[PDB]
């Protein structure tokens, strides 16, 4: 298992524009297009992202290309962030994947707001971080996915994904 397979499980793959759990136009493997309620705005963000006239449908290769860029962007967002970077550097490889998963889902600023959780993660207080992580809109809105990510931070294993 790895970050790619982990996010593929958590996000799924859809080849036609869909609404994500928040109601936002999304495509592929959790690639958010726009927060605007306009499907036309989505389609135009999508043509721009793919570089051709898609009319709201993309191939699997194209979904996987966006996915690669988004995993890459999430890692870079962590490394460029003063609050995220030192926690990430402190983590083993499995728990680093949980951090990328979170940034992917909610962005760099969202995650950087888990101030107390970040500190407990840095100190390797795993059970306490896990309790704190769960007290969040994140966990209440997407409990199954959040439980999987939390268990990964808690145990440092891929058990929640097998
Ligand atoms: Cl893009
Ligand atoms: Cl979920």
UniProtKB/Swiss-Prot annotation:
CDD domains: T4-like_lys. It holds the Pfam family Phage_lysozyme. Substrate binds at residues 32, 104, 117, 132. The keyword Lipid biosynthesis does not apply. The keyword Nucleus does not apply. InterPro entries: Endolysin_T4_type (IPR034690), Glyco_hydro_24 (IPR002196), Lysozyme-like_dom_sf (IPR023346), Lysozyme_dom_sf (IPR023347), Phage_lysozyme-like (IPR052619), T4-type_lysozyme (IPR001165). Optimum pH is 7.3. Changing residue 26 to E: Complete loss of activity at neutral pH; covalently bound substrate. Its main location: host cell. Gene3D superfamilies: 1.10.530.40. GO terms for molecular function: lysozyme activity. GO terms for cellular component: host cell cytoplasm. It comes from the Viruses. Induction: Expressed late in the viral replication. One of its GO terms (biological process) is viral release from host cell by cytolysis. Changing residue 132 to I: 5-fold decrease in enzymatic activity. It catalyses: Hydrolysis of (1->4)-beta-linkages between N-acetylmuramic acid and N-acetyl-D-glucosamine residues in a peptidoglycan and between N-acetyl-D-glucosamine residues in chitodextrins. The active site is at 11 (proton donor/acceptor), 20 (proton donor/acceptor). Its EC number is 3.2.1.17. Keywords: Antimicrobial, Bacteriolytic enzyme, Cytolysis, Glycosidase, Host cell lysis by virus, Host cytoplasm, Hydrolase, Viral release from host cell. It is found in: Host cytoplasm. Endolysin with lysozyme activity that degrades host peptidoglycans and participates with the holin and spanin proteins in the sequential events which lead to the programmed host cell lysis releasing the mature viral particles. Once the holin has permeabilized the host cell membrane, the endolysin can reach the periplasm and break down the peptidoglycan layer. Belongs to the glycosyl hydrolase 24 family. PANTHER family: T4-TYPE LYSOZYME 1-RELATED. This is Endolysin. It comes from Enterobacteria phage T4 (Bacteriophage T4). The gene is E.
């Amino acid at each position: 298992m790895n970050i790619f397979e982990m996010l593929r499980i958590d996000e799924g793959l859809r080849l036609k524009i869909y609404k994500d759990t928040e109601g936002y136009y999304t495509i592929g493997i959790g690639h958010l297009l726009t927060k605007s309620p306009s499907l036309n705005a989505a389609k135009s963000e999508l043509d721009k992202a793919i570089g051709r006239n898609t009319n709201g449908v993309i191939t699997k290769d194209e979904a996987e290309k966006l996915f690669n860029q988004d995993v890459d962007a999430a890692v870079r967002g962590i490394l460029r962030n003063a609050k995220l970077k030192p926690v990430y550097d402190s983590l083993d490889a499995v728990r680093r994947a949980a951090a990328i998963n979170m940034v992917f889902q909610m962005g760099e600023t969202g995650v950087a707001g888990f101030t107390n959780s970040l500190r407990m993660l840095q100190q390797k207080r795993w059970d306490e971080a896990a309790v704190n992580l769960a007290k969040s809109r994140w966990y209440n809105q997407t409990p199954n996915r959040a439980k999987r990510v939390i268990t990964t931070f808690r145990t440092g294993t891929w058990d929640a994904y097998k």
